[PDB]
Structures are given as structure tokens and as C-alpha cells.
Amino acid sequence: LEDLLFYTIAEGQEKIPVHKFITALKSTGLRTSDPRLKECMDMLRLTLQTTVMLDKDLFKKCVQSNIVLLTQAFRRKFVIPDFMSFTSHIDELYESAKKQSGGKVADYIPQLAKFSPDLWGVSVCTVDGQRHSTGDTKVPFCLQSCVKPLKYAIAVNDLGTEYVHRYVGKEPSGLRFNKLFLNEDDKPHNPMVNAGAIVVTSLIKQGVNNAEKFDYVMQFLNKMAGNEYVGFSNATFQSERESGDRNFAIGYYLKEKKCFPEGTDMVGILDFYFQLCSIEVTCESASVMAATLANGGFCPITGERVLSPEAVRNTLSLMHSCGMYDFSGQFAFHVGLPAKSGVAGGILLVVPNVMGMMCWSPPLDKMGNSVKGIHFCHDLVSLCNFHNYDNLRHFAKKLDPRR
Amino acid sequence: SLEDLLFYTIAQEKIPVHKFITALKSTGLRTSDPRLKECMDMLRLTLVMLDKDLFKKCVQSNIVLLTQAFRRKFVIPDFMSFTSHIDELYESAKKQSGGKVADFSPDLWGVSVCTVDGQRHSTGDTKVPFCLQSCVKPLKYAIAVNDLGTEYVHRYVGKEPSGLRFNKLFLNEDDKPHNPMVNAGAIVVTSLIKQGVNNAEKFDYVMQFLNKMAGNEYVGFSNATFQSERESGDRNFAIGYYLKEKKCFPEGTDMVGILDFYFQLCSIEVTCESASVMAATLANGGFCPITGERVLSPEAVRNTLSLMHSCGMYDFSGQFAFHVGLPAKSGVAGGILLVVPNVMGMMCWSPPLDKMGNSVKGIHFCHDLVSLCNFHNYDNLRHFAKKLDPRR
Amino acid sequence: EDLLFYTIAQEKIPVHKFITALKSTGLRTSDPRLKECMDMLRLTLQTTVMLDKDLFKKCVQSNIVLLTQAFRRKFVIPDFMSFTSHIDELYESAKKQSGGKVADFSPDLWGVSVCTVDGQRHSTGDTKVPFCLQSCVKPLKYAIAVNDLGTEYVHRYVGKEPSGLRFNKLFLNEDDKPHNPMVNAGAIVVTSLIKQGVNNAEKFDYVMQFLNKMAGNEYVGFSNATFQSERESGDRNFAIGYYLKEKKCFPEGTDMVGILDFYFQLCSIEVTCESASVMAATLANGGFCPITGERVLSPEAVRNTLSLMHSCGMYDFSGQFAFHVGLPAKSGVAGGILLVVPNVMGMMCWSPPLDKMGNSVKGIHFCHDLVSLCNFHNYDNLRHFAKKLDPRR
Amino acid sequence: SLEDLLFYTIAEGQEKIPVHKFITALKSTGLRTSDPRLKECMDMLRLTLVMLDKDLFKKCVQSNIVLLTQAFRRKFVIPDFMSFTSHIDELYESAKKQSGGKVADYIPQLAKFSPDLWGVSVCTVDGQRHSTGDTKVPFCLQSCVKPLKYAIAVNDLGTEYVHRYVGKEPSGLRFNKLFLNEDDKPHNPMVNAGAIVVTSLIKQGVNNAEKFDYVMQFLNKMAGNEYVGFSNATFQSERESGDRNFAIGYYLKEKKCFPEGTDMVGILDFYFQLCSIEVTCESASVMAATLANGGFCPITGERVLSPEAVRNTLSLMHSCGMYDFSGQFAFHVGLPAKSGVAGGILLVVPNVMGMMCWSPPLDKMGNSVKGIHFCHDLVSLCNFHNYDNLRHFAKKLDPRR
Numbered sequence A: 001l002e003d004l005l006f007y008t009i010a011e012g013q014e015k016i017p018v019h020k021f022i023t024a025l026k027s028t029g030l031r032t033s034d035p036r037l038k039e040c041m042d043m044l045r046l047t048l049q050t051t052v053m054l055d056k057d058l059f060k061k062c063v064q065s066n067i068v069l070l071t072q073a074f075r076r077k078f079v080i081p082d083f084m085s086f087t088s089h090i091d092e093l094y095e096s097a098k099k100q101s102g103g104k105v106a107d108y109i110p111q112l113a114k115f116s117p118d119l120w121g122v123s124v125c126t127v128d129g130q131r132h133s134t135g136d137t138k139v140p141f142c143l144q145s146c147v148k149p150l151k152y153a154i155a156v157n158d159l160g161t162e163y164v165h166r167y168v169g170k171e172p173s174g175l176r177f178n179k180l181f182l183n184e185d186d187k188p189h190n191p192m193v194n195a196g197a198i199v200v201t202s203l204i205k206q207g208v209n210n211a212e213k214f215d216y217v218m219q220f221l222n223k224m225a226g227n228e229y230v231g232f233s234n235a236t237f238q239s240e241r242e243s244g245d246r247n248f249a250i251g252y253y254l255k256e257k258k259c260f261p262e263g264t265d266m267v268g269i270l271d272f273y274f275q276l277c278s279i280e281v282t283c284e285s286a287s288v289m290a291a292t293l294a295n296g297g298f299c300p301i302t303g304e305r306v307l308s309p310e311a312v313r314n315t316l317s318l319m320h321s322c323g324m325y326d327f328s329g330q331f332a333f334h335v336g337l338p339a340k341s342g343v344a345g346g347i348l349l350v351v352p353n354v355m356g357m358m359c360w361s362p363p364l365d366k367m368g369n370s371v372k373g374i375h376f377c378h379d380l381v382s383l384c385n386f387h388n389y390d391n392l393r394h395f396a397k398k399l400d401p402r403r
Numbered sequence B: 001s002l003e004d005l006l007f008y009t010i011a012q013e014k015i016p017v018h019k020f021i022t023a024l025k026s027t028g029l030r031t032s033d034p035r036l037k038e039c040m041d042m043l044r045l046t047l048v049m050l051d052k053d054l055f056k057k058c059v060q061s062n063i064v065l066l067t068q069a070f071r072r073k074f075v076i077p078d079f080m081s082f083t084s085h086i087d088e089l090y091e092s093a094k095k096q097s098g099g100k101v102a103d104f105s106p107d108l109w110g111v112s113v114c115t116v117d118g119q120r121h122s123t124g125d126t127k128v129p130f131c132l133q134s135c136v137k138p139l140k141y142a143i144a145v146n147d148l149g150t151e152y153v154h155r156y157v158g159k160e161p162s163g164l165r166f167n168k169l170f171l172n173e174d175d176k177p178h179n180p181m182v183n184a185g186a187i188v189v190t191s192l193i194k195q196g197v198n199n200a201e202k203f204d205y206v207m208q209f210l211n212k213m214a215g216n217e218y219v220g221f222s223n224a225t226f227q228s229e230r231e232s233g234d235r236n237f238a239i240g241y242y243l244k245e246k247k248c249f250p251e252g253t254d255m256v257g258i259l260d261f262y263f264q265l266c267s268i269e270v271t272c273e274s275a276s277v278m279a280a281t282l283a284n285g286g287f288c289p290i291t292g293e294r295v296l297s298p299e300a301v302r303n304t305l306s307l308m309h310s311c312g313m314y315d316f317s318g319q320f321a322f323h324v325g326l327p328a329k330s331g332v333a334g335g336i337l338l339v340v341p342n343v344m345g346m347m348c349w350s351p352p353l354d355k356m357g358n359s360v361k362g363i364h365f366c367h368d369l370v371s372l373c374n375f376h377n378y379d380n381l382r383h384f385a386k387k388l389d390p391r392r
Numbered sequence C: 001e002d003l004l005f006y007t008i009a010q011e012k013i014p015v016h017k018f019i020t021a022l023k024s025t026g027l028r029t030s031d032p033r034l035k036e037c038m039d040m041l042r043l044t045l046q047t048t049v050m051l052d053k054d055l056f057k058k059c060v061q062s063n064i065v066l067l068t069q070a071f072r073r074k075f076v077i078p079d080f081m082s083f084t085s086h087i088d089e090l091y092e093s094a095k096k097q098s099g100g101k102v103a104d105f106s107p108d109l110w111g112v113s114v115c116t117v118d119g120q121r122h123s124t125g126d127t128k129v130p131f132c133l134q135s136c137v138k139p140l141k142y143a144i145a146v147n148d149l150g151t152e153y154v155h156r157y158v159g160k161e162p163s164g165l166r167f168n169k170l171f172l173n174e175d176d177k178p179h180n181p182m183v184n185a186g187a188i189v190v191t192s193l194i195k196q197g198v199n200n201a202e203k204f205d206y207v208m209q210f211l212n213k214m215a216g217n218e219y220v221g222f223s224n225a226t227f228q229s230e231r232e233s234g235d236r237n238f239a240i241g242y243y244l245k246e247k248k249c250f251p252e253g254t255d256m257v258g259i260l261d262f263y264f265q266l267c268s269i270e271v272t273c274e275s276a277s278v279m280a281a282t283l284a285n286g287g288f289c290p291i292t293g294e295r296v297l298s299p300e301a302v303r304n305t306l307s308l309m310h311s312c313g314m315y316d317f318s319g320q321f322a323f324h325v326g327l328p329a330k331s332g333v334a335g336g337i338l339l340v341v342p343n344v345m346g347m348m349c350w351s352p353p354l355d356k357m358g359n360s361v362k363g364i365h366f367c368h369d370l371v372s373l374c375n376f377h378n379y380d381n382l383r384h385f386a387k388k389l390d391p392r393r
Numbered sequence D: 001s002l003e004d005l006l007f008y009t010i011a012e013g014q015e016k017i018p019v020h021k022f023i024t025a026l027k028s029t030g031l032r033t034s035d036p037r038l039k040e041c042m043d044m045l046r047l048t049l050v051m052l053d054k055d056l057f058k059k060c061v062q063s064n065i066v067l068l069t070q071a072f073r074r075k076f077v078i079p080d081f082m083s084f085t086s087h088i089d090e091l092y093e094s095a096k097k098q099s100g101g102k103v104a105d106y107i108p109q110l111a112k113f114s115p116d117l118w119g120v121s122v123c124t125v126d127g128q129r130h131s132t133g134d135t136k137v138p139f140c141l142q143s144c145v146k147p148l149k150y151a152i153a154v155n156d157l158g159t160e161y162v163h164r165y166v167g168k169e170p171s172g173l174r175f176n177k178l179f180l181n182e183d184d185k186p187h188n189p190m191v192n193a194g195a196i197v198v199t200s201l202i203k204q205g206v207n208n209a210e211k212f213d214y215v216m217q218f219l220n221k222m223a224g225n226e227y228v229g230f231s232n233a234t235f236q237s238e239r240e241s242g243d244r245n246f247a248i249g250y251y252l253k254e255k256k257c258f259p260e261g262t263d264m265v266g267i268l269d270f271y272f273q274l275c276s277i278e279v280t281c282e283s284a285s286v287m288a289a290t291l292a293n294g295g296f297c298p299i300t301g302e303r304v305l306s307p308e309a310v311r312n313t314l315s316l317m318h319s320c321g322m323y324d325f326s327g328q329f330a331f332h333v334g335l336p337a338k339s340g341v342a343g344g345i346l347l348v349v350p351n352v353m354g355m356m357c358w359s360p361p362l363d364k365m366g367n368s369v370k371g372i373h374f375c376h377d378l379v380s381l382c383n384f385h386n387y388d389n390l391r392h393f394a395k396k397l398d399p400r401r
């Protein structure tokens, strides 16, 4: 194994230069900081202080702990084998959406209004841990409604579908009912609207205070993002709470109609709910969260199982049909990917079995969705055969980046 | 030599015919497959024992397809096992004797499968004709989008469910039927097809289209259903007049004529067998899997499968999308057209319907199928719990 | 009889004077309840322009009860001349409201007729021009239905409330009944209740007789041109017919396509402002025609009808009108507004150009102004009415 | 003179009049000896005291002589009131046999009221009074307060201001669960969302204690100083369990329905206070008669409300007053009325009388079973429907004759 891969990377010459190995490694799309590569990069750093050039036996020493993963990377066995070609396509789509500079930045609170209209970043993480970022991908921003699927998933993971769906429905309202809080069975319509998300919030880690509930959720997001940036915006929390009249309206109505688990402190659930909307990510950390969803609940950069299959399948289903506000039907039809948008300008996107993305540009269209994000998501499915109901064999002129 | 490679695989110095036949059948292909006609013609002509020379002679024309078959390269390589499961599911749904026939023996129950590679299986009453009714709706939507394009068609009809609270309005807020899967939308879609020729030629064209989709298996027509439908279709006449008034038809429409065509299209007959092939065409990117012919554009199939996902099972559409996550379309005669994209097509048929209008046994079967196998649209192909994956 | 002689008298009364004293009450000389008196007057003018106590007794003794009421100022509006001056000003004031769009008649056309509950009459503007009732016919055929069948039977088929402004495009309430008789679906179902079992010609004739008595035999006609136009462009009403058939809204054995033909017929019936004012006065008068004394409708029928006109009578402006005008009123697409001031009078206003909601602009302006001036709002007080005039005193 | 004329009428050719013979003659007209408009006469009888001559009688009745004349020359709006009250007494005994319905139980205060409590009080626009049953037992107005606070608002601010924050129409049965109409305003003042907004309009820019006092003063004049109180127990239970009204408040706040500078949580406190105000059938009936009498309290003569306020209030009670039964009630009864969850029905017969009916058990709609039955019978008997005709009314009774 260690030896066979030596012959792939050497191919004549009995010594591999270190940079040659690293630069072939990066070109698969793995980063050198990948947690699954640490034994190998540790042994490499130590070799460079013990002697820029590797024999068979020294290469064996470095890679033998991580050899299964390096083999797949070098045998082009990753989900996207020509990743360099792919990223060049992402970059083109990025540049094309960059010309769409209309929309209006959200301003209802000071913290959304301050963000520049020209911030625009796209991050990819495949289900094999291959990474790409273009534009403003290391700039923190609040998840807002992008957190709705993540706390839904956490709820289904801990409690099961059956319990969760005793409290929250499973369908879009339909466009003329995007301002009823309840369906005919007196449940919120689905987890992706505010009333539904407020009830989901009330299910998570019952019988502990908000500090522990918050810490428990944050632990969960950490694992989903493979330990990348997950932070918190107190400024955003305070504004959300000092101006969430509509969500307070939702909470009293739900209390009235008995929508909560017994023993619920509705006013504290609203506090929890605003906290969760204020959790901060970057394009890069969030792309990994989306890839966990794309990868059956396994984080692709650590290999850790974070969510049950049930949790992930339910979440992708509801993101497909209810994920993009009143554009949910049009998006399902034209893009046909699980996606969730937010008022900060994020679009969490999942291509099941392939990758997770986060697109972010603050300016929103009249439905609440990032203009550039929406433009990018249309272009991505125009280009690649990723639509849910694209055929994997007969896909016309679309490119299939899995071949 | 490709024909000699396959000769050695199957053999011994001499292959009996019956032995080649039964090895072929175990791949799931049928000897009447159109793509295997030259081979079967050649065997008929040399008739019970084949040498290498004579075997090459019979199979050389269809050698590529026979190679895949005996190379387990088909989408379900172990088809004999897969059909065993299907039979268990069939028998399990057979015990679900609830529901009410629309007003056929209530005890009629069949299930047919056609993979995207042409592998076939049937259990139960799969050769008994019955009317598509609303199962026809995705098929004529597909035709419309095939001939005219997404942009044209979606000027007349929407892309979304109404929402449970809205199963009773004919139009969305833009004055268009909500989607092609409800009566009002289907009526408008019927008005788009083959404009400016008379109903007899429109019917002929649609029938020719359905024939390709079914790979020339049974498609027919119940005049008795047609007459019954037009006599008792007051709701659809209300829909037609509403649509006319609200100006939902293309310029020059004869509205009452379109209702006649609409009732005709609902009265078209299939069996479970022929309809499974139509479903497989949709599962196979617009190519008929037992003839190799492209019947529909990939646009037409994508659109159709999406709208079947969200809008396909009446008021059970949203529950069905969540629990089953497959494109499907039910009809009042008890049919459920089911597509498992990239894998197979299925028709299930059992006349007794639940309180929502969907075949009881069909519904149980569909739930079980996705409980068993990782076919839900948002199952993961790598990490998938205790489920069976028939592709591996 | 003698008493009345002194009131109008010398010991001799010129004929012209009696006549002009009579007209000033606001009775017309053609009033059917005055025909024996006016016959005798025409005859005595032949039999010899001046009347003694005995000659005057021979004319007016057949109709002395009604003349004594007119002359003792015992009619519902006693100073009718002053009131008609007020109507004339409101007429002129509406006449400057020249907005609105004619339904697709001259936009200039604008008339207002009045008939009190005692038969006193007044007209201004284009009051002798025929026009189709259209939706103004809806309360008249409701009244007929309730008259023949009773409230309980009719209201198994039709509700008794407004949809509410969001429900104004649904055909059925939650009970699977049209909301009320004043919308098309409810009217179509009421049409289906009237004179069941006979053909459309006898049904139409039957309804025409009824209108003739409500209008005291003044003009009730028919526009075939309007009928043809309505049928060859009534898709929404055919949509309604089929939907109602589907939901089993009709009485057993209804021919629904025939009922739509009958329905379009009744929409095409023609009145003038003058004849229609008398129809509205019949409703104002507990179902008695004020110019003949004939009982045309049961009280139950008229109460029911006024109620539903109050709440559902002006299309989507029904709620606003009930609040600000507080009168039973029914509008139609020809520019008609049938108006009732219960216990006082009926009116027909007519001006083709309609506002955004389908109601004659000028009619609507006149009705607002009428209720600003006078204490006729349903819930105006009779003792304590601020700035308003009360024309009953 | 007037005092002499009235002397002979009651004397009946006698030279003197016993007091008890003047009092019972007076009481048969419908008036009570405690009528505020009869204080000066009643005082002057107290003072002189059992037999009155022409001169003594004239002395006693001078100041009130306009009112006593109208009464003794049968000039009151219901001239034979003894006959009328007997008709009311038979309707009350007939509604008494209707003992179905559920007493409201959702707070401790309403759930303890006996189901058999049943009172009917009448007060004509002339101050004639009849009570049968349990008419002196305090109970909360609840939603019967809504027309009263609306009247006050329209009295103080005018129609045009008030209807900038609240609508003029019922929602339609199937919109009994929406808070706002298409223009983002509560549908009418007779629903909770409407009444919360109306409550925010009243006496703006003072504290809730002064606001409450102002409304309580207004209610006193409306009742001609008869019993008005407050149930602090009710107020406490309402605020504790009013989660739906908090939902409404926050929705209205979000959607910007309140006047500028509103403290929404404070308005909800005031709203709950107003619902917890107590009346009896007797005092309520007088409030209803004020509305029946164009804004003039019939037993004090005082102008309490503008004619605008009263007309607007009666219109909106006609159409929106009886919860989801509003349209059926308008149709069959055709009188302005408002019902409350304590079992009250505030009823106005314009130009004739006010009533309060009170029986705690509610039907499925929320309206008193017995009150509803009574109201139907009342209008079966008498030509009081708003669209009954005054000349041709069939075999109905007209009590104004």
C-alpha cells in the first residue's frame, strides 16, 4: 500500500521531494490541516528536523498511519476525482454571480444593516473532505434561519421522528397561508418556519437551564463543522430580543393552543430561540456542517458520526420543500437541492452524496433570499447534473463532476 | 472475442439452449425483450444444443447487452434476490384488505417492476387492464414539456402544491392552476397539447407517445369509463367554465372540446406490466429501457418527477414525500405509478382506496419498500442504517 | 267630506285649485286610488270650471278617506314640497360626481325617483329611461321565493350572511350553501326555488306578474339584447351552475342549465326609475303597494329581504354602506341603486358609470348625502338627531 | 293649570287624594319612586307627612309636573306598561325552562355561578322599569363592555379617528381566527383584537388608574348612577390566563396597529380591567336605554354620548355583537345586542328601551341559552325587529299603541 503509492508519486527517481508530495496532496482538494491527516503531517514535520527528500522507508514511516485515506486520494477515488477542474467551474460561477449586485441588505436590526453589500463568499466541502473557497469565506455571520434545519436534526437525533412530529408538521403551508402560525391540526406547519422552529427549540434538552441547552447545541454544531469556527453574536442576540414582537406573538399563541411539551417556560424558550439565531459561522465552517448532512450524518473531515440517518433524511426532506421561504416551491422545482436561507444572506446548501456548500452575500431579494446565492444555485444546477431528479446516466449537456 | 468470452462463462464443450435461456432469465431480462429480438430470431431459426460457432452466430448482434447482463453490470445485479423481497412485500400488503372501491373485485392486487436496464418482475394481477385516470397526468405533462418547453407550459400552470387548506380552490394567486397534478392544472395541460388539430388526432398522438413510453406493451381505451366520466364530471365542467372566464386557456381554445379530450385521456387503459415500463422510462432519463429509444427530453422527465414528488398523492402528497420520498402518482381505479430514479419503475394496482383516494395496499407496499431499501430520495448511498441496498 | 270642502274653500272652489292643492301633497292625479274622483271630475266638466258644496261631494266621496289624509297633512312626509326641494339639491350635488366607468348607455344619464309609503311621488333627471335591473332583481325574487315557500324552506338552500371580504370569490359557505341571496350563486339557487315543476315561460310570466303588482302596474319590460349578451358571456355563472350541481345545492329534479337561462332572463328585466321607486316603496310599506293598496308580499318576505339588503346589498361596499348609510339598498351593473327607507319611502337612483366596486358613483354620493341631511339611518334616533332634518314632522 | 288638571284626574271627583293612591297610580306608569327626575316631588312628600289637598299636592308636584303629566296622560313610549310587563313575565318563565348550556369554567370566578340564575331587566327611553328574576346580582360585563368603550372612544375622538385603527365589519365566519383584515386593522370593535385597539385610544397619556376612573365615571352616567363595580378576582384570573390576548397584543404591536407611544402591556392590563367591571341587570338595562335614547340617560335626562357614538355603536352591535351567531341574530332578531361570557346580553330596542338579560349557561357559540331564547320570543311577539314595518306587521303585538 505504502509502497504502491510510492511508485505512483515517484515514477522514476528513488526519492520523492517533500513539496512534490504536498502539492499532489493539495491538488486532490484535501487540506494539509485535515484532522484525518495529522499523524502523517506530524511525521513529516519531524522528518524535516531530523535530517527535503524521502526514500521508500522514510515515506513508509510518514504515511502508514493515514494510508487508507491517501490511497483513495491518489487513486482518484474521491467523489469528485478531477477536483481542480471542478473548482475552476465554481470560480467561474462565483464570478458570474458577482455581477448581480441588486437586492437589499437586511436592516431591521443594526447588526445586519452594517454588513457591506459586496461581501460574497462560497465554500465547498465534499463528503470526502475536499475543500474549496472563493471570496469572503472567513468572515463571520449569524446563521439566522440557517440554524433551523440544524436544531431540527438535533431534535430528531435525540428524540426520534415520531415524538418531534407530535409537535411540528411536515409540509409547506402553501403561499396564501405563509402567515398562519398553525395548520388545521393545530401544529406549526413545519420546522423551517418561525413557529415550527420555536416549538422545535422547546423540545431540545428539556429540564435544564438555557446555558446548558445552549452549550449542548454548541457542542453539537462543533462536531458538525469538524471543530471549525462556531461563535456567538451577543449584539445580534440583544437586538433580536428587543424587537421580536412577532415571535412573542407566536409564543403566546402556541402557549394558548397547547403546542409545547408540558412544563415549558415559553418566555425562556423564546430567549433560547433568539440565542440560536445569533450563532455565528463562516462560509468555511458552515460548508462542513452542510457536508455532514450530505454525508449521512458523518462529518467528512473527522469521520465522526454526529447525527442519525433518520435525523439527516428528515432534515434534507424538509429543506427541499420548506427551505427558501415563499420561493421554496420554485427552488425545489428549478434547483431541486435541500437548501436553507437566512436573513444575514447565507444559503446552506446540500448536494446529497456529493458535497455541502455555504453561499453568503447579505443583499436579499423581495422573498428574503440572497440574490447572489440564488443566482449561483441556479447556475450550479444548470452546469452539473445535481438536481434531485436529474438522471445519472442520461443528463443531456450537463457535466457530471463524479466521472 | 466478446462472444467467445461469454461462451466460456456459460459453459463443457456444448451449451444446451434451455440452459442459456434460464441463465438469461435469471438476470431478469425477458426473452421477448425487443433489444434481444435478433438473438431470439436466430435461435428460433436453428431449432437443442449449441457449439461455440453457432452460439456466436445467434448472440453476436445483441452481444453488448448480453455481456452486461451476465456481467451483473445491471443496476440490480442480484435480481433473483431482489424479486424475493418484492414478493414478501406484495404478500404483506395483500393482507391490507381495508378501504373502499370507487363507484372490479376488491381482491385484485398486482405489482410490476421494470428496472432502467429492462429487468422485469410481476406478482399478482398484473395483466388485467384498468384506467390510468389521474396516473395519466404526469404522462401528459411530460408530453407537453417535451413538445413546448418548461417556460411555455408554466405560463398556464403552477409548480407547487396548494397546501391542505387549499385543496378546493382552482387557481393560485397568479390566476393559474396550482400544478399539473390536480384536475384544474391537468385540464389546462390538456389544452396545450397538439394545438390546432382536432381531438381524434390529438388522442392518436398521445396514444402513439404512450406506446413508446411503454415500449409497445398494452395501451388501450375504455369507452365505458369515458361515457361515465363525461356524464358525471360536473366538477370538471365547473373547472372548465372557471378557467375560461379567468382566461387560463391558450388563445383559440374550444373549452368543451378540451373536456372531452380530458375525459378521454383519463379513460386510457394499461396493465401493471405496461405501466411499469412507462414508469421505468421516467426513471431512465426519458429513454425507454426495453427498446433503447428516447421518448422524452431530460427536461420533461426532471419536471415531471419533481411535480410527482410534491403533488402526486392528493392530500397525502406531503406525508408521502416525507416518509417515502419517491415520485409517485395515484389514480381512482387503484393505480400507483411509482418511479425510483436511476433504478426502476413500478405500477401497483389494487382498487380499494383509503379516505384520501389512494390505493390502500399500494400505499402499504410503498412504505414497506422504502423501509426495506435505501430508495428514499434523501437516503445516503454510503451510510444508511439497517436498510438493504439492492444496487451493491 | 263637507269638512274638506271648507278647508279648500267662498262657497265655490275652482277645479284647477283643487287639483293644484292635490298635487302639492305629492299625490299624482293618475293615482289608481283616486280614479273614481278623477273620473267624476272629468264627467262633471262635460256635464257643464267651478264646484258647489254638493257637486264636490259627488266627486270625492268614493275616495274621501285618502283625500282627508292628504289634506290634513297626515301623510308620512307632511311637507312634501320642502322635501322635494331637498331631493332636487342632492340630485344636483351628485350630478357633479362625473367619475366611474360605464359597464361593458350615456354616462350623462342620472335620475332619482321617490315613492313614499303613502303614494307621494317625485322625479328628477332621467327617470323615464328604461334600464335592466341586473342584480337589483335579486331581492325581488328572494322576496317572491320567501312569500311562496317560507323562510325555513328557502334558507335550507341559501345562507343569510355576507361572506366577508376575503370569502368574496368562494361560491359556498362552510355549510355548502351560497352565502346569501344577494350574490350570484345564492341568486342562482333562489331562482331554482321559484315555481318548481313548470317551464321557463310560465316561471317568467309568474315573476313578471309579481313585479307588475310591486310596481303598481308601471313599466316592467324585458331586454332581449341584454339577455343574449348575458348568456353568450356568462362563463362564471355556468361555472357556478356546475359547481352547485356537483355539491347538490339545487332542489331534487332541477334542470340546472334551464335555471341559468331563467336566471339570465330575470337579470334582463327592465324598469324605469319611476316604476322601480314604487317597487322599493312596496318593500318600505310592509309588502303593500302604496299606489294601489294591494298586498303583494308577506311581511316575513319583506323583513327577510330588507335584512339581507342591509348587510349584503352593495357588493364589497356592503359593510361600509351598512355603517355609513344604514339603509337596505341593492345595486346593479346598469347603474341602478334600489333603496328603501322603511316606514317612509322607496327610491331608485340610476347613473351608468360605476366605481371600482361596481356601484354607481352618483347613486353612492346621493345615498351618503341623503343620510347626512335626514335622520333615516337605521340607528338614527327619532327624538335626538343632532344637526339632521326629520321630514316626518 | 297643569298641577290642578292632574289633581282632578287622580282625585276622581273627591276633594282629597291619599298618598298611597298617588304612589300606586305613579308606579303603574312604570316609573319608580326613586327616579332621579322625581327627587323634588318625593322629597316634598317626605317633608309634609297621608291625605293631600289640591294645594298640598300642587306644592309637592310642581317641579316634576312636566314629567308626571306625560306619565298620567299615557304619553310614554309604552303607554300600557302594566300589560307589557306581564308579556315580559311570560317570556321570562318560558326561557326559564331552557336550562341547557355550559357555565363558563375556564377561570374560578365564572365557574362558580349557579346555572339557574336568570334575570331580565327593562328600561324604556322614558325611564319605565321592569325586572324579573335575579336582577340585583352583580356580574362582570366581559365582552358586553366592548360597545361601551367603543362609544366612549367615538364620543371623545370621533368616527374618523377611531376607524383609522379599527374596521367597521364582521370578518365572515371563517375568519374568526384572523386578528387583522386586509388593511392590517382589527375587523371591528366587537372582537378582542378590535377592543384592545379601542382600549388603547381612550384617554391617552395618563396612567391606567386615571383611565380606569374616567371610564368608570362614564359608565356611572350611562347607568344613571346605578350599580357599577369591579371584580379584582376576575381581573387577576383574566391577566393570568389571557395568553390569546397577549398573542393579539404582540401581533398588533408588530403590525403597528396601536397609536404612537403606546405601552402595549399596560393596555392589556387596562383591557382586562375593563372586562372585569361589574353591573347588575338593573343598572345595565339603563346603560342599554341610554343607547336606545340617542345618548341621553333616560332616568337622569343627562346627555352622556354624542349621536355619532350611539349610531356607530348600534350599527356594529347589529352586525358583530353575538360572536359567530352575529349574522343569524341580525337576520332573525334584528336588534343591536352584545353578549358576554358571564352570561349577559346587552340589548337595545332603538327608540323604545334597553334590556339586560343574564343567565350564566352559554351555548356552543358562547351566548346565553336563556337570553338567546328570550330575545327570539321577544321579537316573535312584538314588532321590534329593525325591519319590521310599523303599519303592516301581521299578528304581531306593537306595545307603543
Ligand SMILES: O=C(Cc1cccc(Oc2ccccc2)c1)Nc1nnc(N[C@@H]2CCN(c3cccnn3)C2)s1
Pocket (backbone or CB within 6 Å): B165, B166, B168, B169, B170, B171, B172, B242, C169, C170, C171, C172, C173, C174, C243, D174
Ligand atoms: O370550501 C368552501 C368554504 C370553506 C369551508 C371551510 C374552510 C374554508 O376556508 C378557506 C378559506 C379560503 C380559501 C379556501 C378555504 C372555506 N367553499 C368554497 N366555495 N367556492 C369554492 N371554490 C370555487 C371555485 C374555485 N374558486 C376559486 C376562487 C379563488 C381562487 N381559486 N378558485 C371558487 S370552495
Ligand SMILES: O=C(Cc1cccc(Oc2ccccc2)c1)Nc1nnc(N[C@@H]2CCN(c3cccnn3)C2)s1
Pocket (backbone or CB within 6 Å): A176, A177, A179, A180, A181, A182, A183, A253, C166, D177, D178, D179, D180, D181, D182, D251
Ligand atoms: O392577512 C390577514 C388577512 C387576510 C388577507 C388576505 C387574504 C387572507 O386569506 C386567508 C384565507 C384563509 C385563511 C387565512 C387567510 C387573509 N390577516 C391576519 N390576521 N391574523 C393572522 N394571523 C393570526 C396569528 C396566527 N393566526 C392563525 C389562525 C389560524 C391558524 N393559524 N394561525 C391568526 S394573518
